Amino acid sequence: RKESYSIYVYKVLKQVHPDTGISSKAMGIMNSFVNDIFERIAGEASRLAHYNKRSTITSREIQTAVRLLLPGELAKHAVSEGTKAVTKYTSA
Amino acid sequence: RKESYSIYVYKVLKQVHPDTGISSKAMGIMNSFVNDIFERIAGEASRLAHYNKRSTITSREIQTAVRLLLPGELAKHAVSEGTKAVTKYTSAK
Amino acid sequence: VRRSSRKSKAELQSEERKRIDELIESGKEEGMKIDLIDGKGRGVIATKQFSRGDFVVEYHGDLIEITDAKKREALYAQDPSTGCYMYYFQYLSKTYCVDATRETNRLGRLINHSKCGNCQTKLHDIDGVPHLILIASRDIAAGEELLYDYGDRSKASIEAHPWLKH
Amino acid sequence: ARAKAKTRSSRAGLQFPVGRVHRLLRKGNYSERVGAGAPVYLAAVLEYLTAEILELAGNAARDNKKTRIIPRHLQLAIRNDEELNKLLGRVTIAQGGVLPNIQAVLLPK
Amino acid sequence: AKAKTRSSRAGLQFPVGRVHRLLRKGNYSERVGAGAPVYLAAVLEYLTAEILELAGNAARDNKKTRIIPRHLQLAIRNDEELNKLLGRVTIAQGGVLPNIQAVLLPK
Amino acid sequence: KRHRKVLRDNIQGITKPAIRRLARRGGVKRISGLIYEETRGVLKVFLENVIRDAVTYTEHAKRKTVTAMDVVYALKRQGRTLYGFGG
Amino acid sequence: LRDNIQGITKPAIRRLARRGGVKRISGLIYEETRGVLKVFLENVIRDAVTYTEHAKRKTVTAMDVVYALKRQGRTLYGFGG
Amino acid sequence: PHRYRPGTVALREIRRYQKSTELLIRKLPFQRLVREIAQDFKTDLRFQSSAVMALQEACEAYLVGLFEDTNLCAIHAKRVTIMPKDIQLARRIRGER
Amino acid sequence: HRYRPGTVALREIRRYQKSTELLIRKLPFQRLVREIAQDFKTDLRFQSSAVMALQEACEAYLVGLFEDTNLCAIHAKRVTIMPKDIQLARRIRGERA
DNA sequence: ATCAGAATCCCGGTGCCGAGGCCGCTCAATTGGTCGTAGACAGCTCTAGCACCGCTTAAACGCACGTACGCGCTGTCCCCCGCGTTTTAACCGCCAAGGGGATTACTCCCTAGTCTCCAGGCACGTGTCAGATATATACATCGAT
DNA sequence: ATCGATGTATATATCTGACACGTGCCTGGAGACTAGGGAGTAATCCCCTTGGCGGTTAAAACGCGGGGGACAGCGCGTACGTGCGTTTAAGCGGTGCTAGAGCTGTCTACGACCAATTGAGCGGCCTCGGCACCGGGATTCTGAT
């Protein structure tokens, strides 16, 4: 039971370029990219929680980790996306 | 009340250079160095344990993290010292 | 359909630049009225809720070199009813002077000195000519006065004007 | 388990698995507890970054008049974008090649 | 019963108990073996003994008796192994190695 | 007593003799004339990065003071681990 | 296996340099590059064999190599991880 | 009997190898070198094919980046030819031993 | 009376590689730090230890950058470091694309 | 050479403040005992890593010649360096206020853990189409007679 | 500066493997519910940060003269590119073999957890000596002669 992000990257692709496919090697590369950015953000959120003597990783910690790791405009837009998603999630 | 490695660094000092002191700034620097190397070794051991899908950090994981993080001769001698300590610690009980 | 609107840093900087140019050459001057201050003379109350980095005014005047800058200020000061309107600045191996005694339709020259106001001035060069911009470097309320620093530490003038330190 | 179930992703409006992200934040030894909005936030950010890379990759593949995104197109997108190249600056992309770039002092006269 | 610190069982001057507490509360793994903190404390003690020995040699060569950031810097930047280990590390109040490129010396 | 109007930068506080002292410590024997503006630009970029990260750490801890641990953590985030400030 | 670094032939290094943008190549570049490559490979393979040994395996795997490289600071996308 | 000036063929090879993505080192000699180097550290090692391909991709990216910086060093020295002093300067500035 | 140009340079080099104190002046550096941080969060405060940490870090950075710059210049058969040398050092180190 | 002549190192002695030893308290490390579960060890299957062998042919290699460039040398011209004078603003001490960092106490609400339900994602097998050659068309490029 | 190889973008045929899609199922995700403890919030105290004042003086700024160092030009020779004939060994496809990865089952030793306790570590105090500093004999560098 091998874990991947292949089907979700397929979904995002068919959402961005609805008439474009993606080879298997590029699929593996996008898989590795998602794994790596996840590992980075999670490790940075862990470091923040340890610094501030907290115990829970929360949206506050994840937002600060995003702001630390992504450069300027990527960070602004990613924080926008995540805040929008969290508000929608707690509303629903 | 905040923890540090001051008295232990001082003990190791009085072991290696018996008639020699260490200023407060160098004491703080050795504190930072001990914390940094501890964090490196512990993070690498954690990462190894997650790689092999195991839950327990052991002397095996710590030894591999030491052999990954320290350059050749430092790593060889640190592995020597750690193995010596673990054997002496298990002999007595 | 899902398309990113990211505007790479070059685009953002260029757009801020063009906004600066068209605003400076727009003469809008949104909400600034001349009034009186209890001891200083005139005052320009801004009636907008400023924030960090936003524009305020342009210190419109005449730009010259330094060989005449070190002279024209004193030559206008020979008239003891001249106020304070000329601005020097050092930029790329040259110092200049903003001749602003001759009255203009702008709101730059109409402000007094302090180190406890709300503005710290920068520079913008719209095609060479360095226009003395004034930005809101902090949060200003609609009903506070434009008040910035002249940078001048002329010990003679600060002797005559003890109010320059405030 | 009544009140027919919908995925946390669907509840959040995302395409990435919020449940899987939660499971990874738990079985990853990052912290003892893990908030409820942390996986949602992280999945939103990961999906955003994936969309941001795939858009440029598809644009490159369409420039080269192709239909399948390939490692070359991923490399081109990443290296040509200013900020993705800073986020992924010390990253090698297998079968990616380099950017076409000849220094100006080597060209003929 | 009478107690003796784990550090004494292992012959270490570094705190095996403090190291074990740090390994636990540091969120490295769900479990921490018995000999893991002993090994880690032994390695930390060895490394600090190396650093301190070289810094004391530097302090002698300077005809002083206290170790200072400058002496730590000299020791580290001179030992090749420790310089590869702490290569991306700045040491406050440490200064730089005395080194003037030959092309600038007077001919 | 009419007075003139000038500016400052707070980046020209990294004076030319200070940059030359740094260069001397680095082993530089002779310094060009534009090295000063170039070095001020470099230093402002480096400072902007480290202070952005330190202020982010501070904001996250809901503090209003930038402690020394915030700077140490920012520097470790850039990859320039700094020893001797409580790290 | 003796003297296999000579298997990085001169035209191979010249191809790598062409990809790098190099126009002309001094003749001493080739031994220098063989040395550089042997050093980089020694480091990465030492770390990979260490990961393998720790996993008590005997096959260096793509994940062991990817982890070695991620530890060198040269993350590699496209082989897992 | 046609013939190009020295340099144009080099520029064409540059454009070619910056258009392509395939591996520029011979797979079997590279694999043989890797097996030797590993044999130095642990005897009787096996290698996944993907492991050796990963090693090759990483080494090729390393050498390509090193040659980009070497070319920058050469151009700095007002040359066109890269030289061992250029590789050594690139590595020393870049932080390698 | 007079020194040959270069001897005072080398004397300064030896002097500033013997010492350890900070070469930038603390009050101007602190003003610079405060004005820079003023653009991320207004009404900030800095532990004097934090400003000292920033200054140690910045001086170490600039010293290492000037060592790399000197290497670039020497490589270019020069002795006077130049902005092109600083730029080459930064580009090879990977700080500016 | 020839020499002086300023920096520079070795030398005392004072002085001051920081470091090293002392001691009382408290909290966290040690000990003993229980338990539950992780991983150690054995067993078995079966993928895939290795070895080999033959053919093809693409790439490496060796040689020869020419010429573009690396490199040494020369000349100039200018732009850093060294020095002396002035100025300015870092710095140090002192005071004085007050923001906010750090700790504590309380309460609540959010997350872990558990159990059950079930659907979505994964392996698996299949149809089909994208893109990689192959050859031809027309064209671009450049090197020289 | 057309000629004429010489290579290169544009087009069509096509076909081969890889990709996108339909299926069954099982395992992990979701829903409900309970307990507890982590964190939010309010209060308080005092630390330590900021701001201003005054004087000193060390350091920065400025101006000037001049020399050495960068840079442009020039000539030479050499070593690197380009091309061609030859060799060699990479690569591809076959098979076969078996080592070793991977998964499963059992069971035990080991680590978490919990409570009683005690001594090791920490914070404050005090003293003395080590390093700094200030002034002095010497000798060791540069630099005009």
H88 neighbourhood in chain G, CB within 8 Å? 32
Token couple for C101: 């005694």
Q: Does the distance separating the beta carbons of E56 and B34 come in below 8 Å? A: no
Whether I42 and I49 have beta carbons less than 8 Å apart is answered as no
Domains of chain A, CATH where assigned: 1-92 (1.10.20.10)
Token couple for H47: 């290698």
β-pairing verdict for C41-46 and C144-145: antiparallel
Angle at E83 between CA E79 and CA E85, to 5 degrees: 125
> What contacts D103, CB < 8 A, 6 or more positions away?
G21, H71, H72, H75
Resolution of the structure in the document, Å? 3.2
Task: Please report, to the nearest 10 degrees, the dihedral formed by the alpha carbons of residues I65, I69, I70, I72 taken in order.
Answer: 140
DSSP C51: -
- Residue ranges of the domains in chain H? 1-97
What's the CA gap between I74 and E102, in Å, rounded?
A: 10
H or E stretch covering D34: strand D33-34
What's the CA gap between E51 and H52, in Å, rounded?
A: 39
Single out the residue of C99, D98, C53 nearest to residue I42, CA to CA.
Answer: C53
In angstroms, the CA of I4 and the C1' of K145 are apart by 17
Query: Which alpha helices (H) appear in chain I, and where do they start and end?
Result: 7-18, 26-37, 48-75, 83-93
What's the CA gap between I90 and D106, in Å, rounded?
A: 22
Residues 15-74 of E with CB under 7 A from strand K: 15, 24, 30-35, 59, 64-66
For A82, C25, C30, C146, I27, the CA distances from C106, given in Å and listed in that order, are 45, 11, 12, 14, 38
Task: List the single residue in H69, H78, H85 with the smallest CB-CB distance to I92.
Answer: H69
- Is strand J less than 7 A from the beta carbon of A59? no
Q: Does the distance separating the beta carbons of I97 and D85 come in below 8 Å? A: yes
C42 marked as binding residue:
yes
Hey, which residues does I80 pair with through a beta bridge?
F30
Residues 24-83 of I with CB under 7 A from strand K: 25, 45-49, 78-80, 82
Whether B25 and E93 have beta carbons less than 8 Å apart is answered as yes
In angstroms, the CA of E1 and the C1' of J32 are apart by 9
The answer to whether residue D104 neighbours chain H at the CB level (below 8 Å) is no
Whether B9 and E48 have beta carbons less than 8 Å apart is answered as yes
Chains contacting chain C through 3 or more C-beta pairs under 8 A: A, D, F, I
Residues 13-32 of B with CB under 7 A from strand K: 21
Token couple for C26: 């727009």
B26 neighbourhood in chain E, CB within 8 Å? 55, 66-69, 71-72
Whether G13 and G30 have beta carbons less than 8 Å apart is answered as yes
Query: Which alpha helices (H) appear in chain D, and where do they start and end?
Result: 8-12, 18-26, 37-63, 71-80, 84-87
For chain E, what is the radius of gyration of the CA atoms?
Answer: 19
Expt. technique: cryo-EM
Strands (E), chain I: 45-46, 80-81
C128 marked as binding residue:
no
C113 marked as binding residue:
yes
Smallest CA–C1' separation from F30, nucleotide? J80
Q: Does the distance separating the beta carbons of G76 and D91 come in below 8 Å? A: yes
Token couple for C150: 């002249």
Single out the residue of A40, A77, A35, A84 nearest to residue A62, CA to CA.
Answer: A40
What's the CA gap between I31 and D49, in Å, rounded?
A: 38
- Is strand J less than 7 A from the beta carbon of H19? no
C59 marked as binding residue:
no
Q: Does the distance separating the beta carbons of E104 and I79 come in below 8 Å? A: yes
Asked whether the CA dihedral H89, H90, H96, H97 is positive or negative, the reply is: negative
Q: Does the distance separating the beta carbons of D29 and E29 come in below 8 Å? A: yes
Query: Domains in chain D: how many in total?
Result: 1
Task: Please report, to the nearest 10 degrees, the dihedral formed by the alpha carbons of residues E66, E69, E70, E72 taken in order.
Answer: 90
Task: Quickly list DSSP for G13-43.
Answer: HHHHHHHHT-SEE-TTHHHHHHHHHHHHHHH
Hey, which residues does F82 pair with through a beta bridge?
E90
In angstroms, the CA of C93 and the C1' of K64 are apart by 19
H or E stretch covering C33: strand C32-37
Query: Domain H1-97's class?
Result: mainly alpha
Whether B60 and B79 have beta carbons less than 8 Å apart is answered as no
Token couple for C111: 């402000």
Q: Does the distance separating the beta carbons of C154 and F4 come in below 8 Å? A: yes
Q: Does the distance separating the beta carbons of E28 and D30 come in below 8 Å? A: no
D51 neighbourhood in chain C, CB within 8 Å? 2, 4
What's the CA gap between G30 and G36, in Å, rounded?
A: 10
Token couple for A77: 């837009």
- Residue ranges of the domains in chain F? 1-87
β-pairing verdict for C54-58 and C133-136: antiparallel
Token couple for C108: 């730059």
Whether C99 and C84 have beta carbons less than 8 Å apart is answered as no
The distance of F75 to chain B (nearest Cα, Å) reads: 13
In angstroms, the CA of A87 and the C1' of K34 are apart by 27
Token couple for F69: 């641990």
Token couple for C4: 């990113």
Q: How far apart are the first and last CA of chain C?
A: 58
C48 marked as binding residue:
no
H or E stretch covering B3: none
Query: Residue C137 CA to chain centroid, in angstroms?
Result: 12
Q: Does the distance separating the beta carbons of H26 and G7 come in below 8 Å? A: yes
Interface present between B and C (3 or more CB pairs within 8 Å): no
F56 neighbourhood in chain A, CB within 8 Å? 64, 67-68
Hey, which residues does E90 pair with through a beta bridge?
F82
Q: Count the alpha carbons within 13 Å of C60 in the hemisphere toward its beta carbon.
A: 14
Whether G76 and G66 have beta carbons less than 8 Å apart is answered as yes
- Residue ranges of the domains in chain C? 1-166
Whether C120 and C148 have beta carbons less than 8 Å apart is answered as yes
The answer to whether residue B46 neighbours chain D at the CB level (below 8 Å) is yes
What's the CA gap between H57 and H26, in Å, rounded?
A: 12
F85 neighbourhood in chain B, CB within 8 Å? 28, 32
Q: Residues of C107-140 as b/e, b for ≥16 C-beta within 10 angstroms?
A: bbbbbbbbeebbbbbeebeeeeebbbbbbbbbeb
Helices F16-26 and I7-18: angle between axes, nearest 10 degrees:
80
Single out the residue of E100, I84, F4, E33 nearest to residue C101, CA to CA.
Answer: F4
Residue of B nearest to E52 (CA): B13
Smallest CA–C1' separation from A19, nucleotide? K20
Angle at B67 between CA B61 and CA B71, to 5 degrees: 155
I91 neighbourhood in chain H, CB within 8 Å? 69, 72
What's the CA gap between E39 and B59, in Å, rounded?
A: 6
What's the CA gap between B50 and G63, in Å, rounded?
A: 13
DSSP E104: G
Tokens 């406890």 belong to which residue? C116
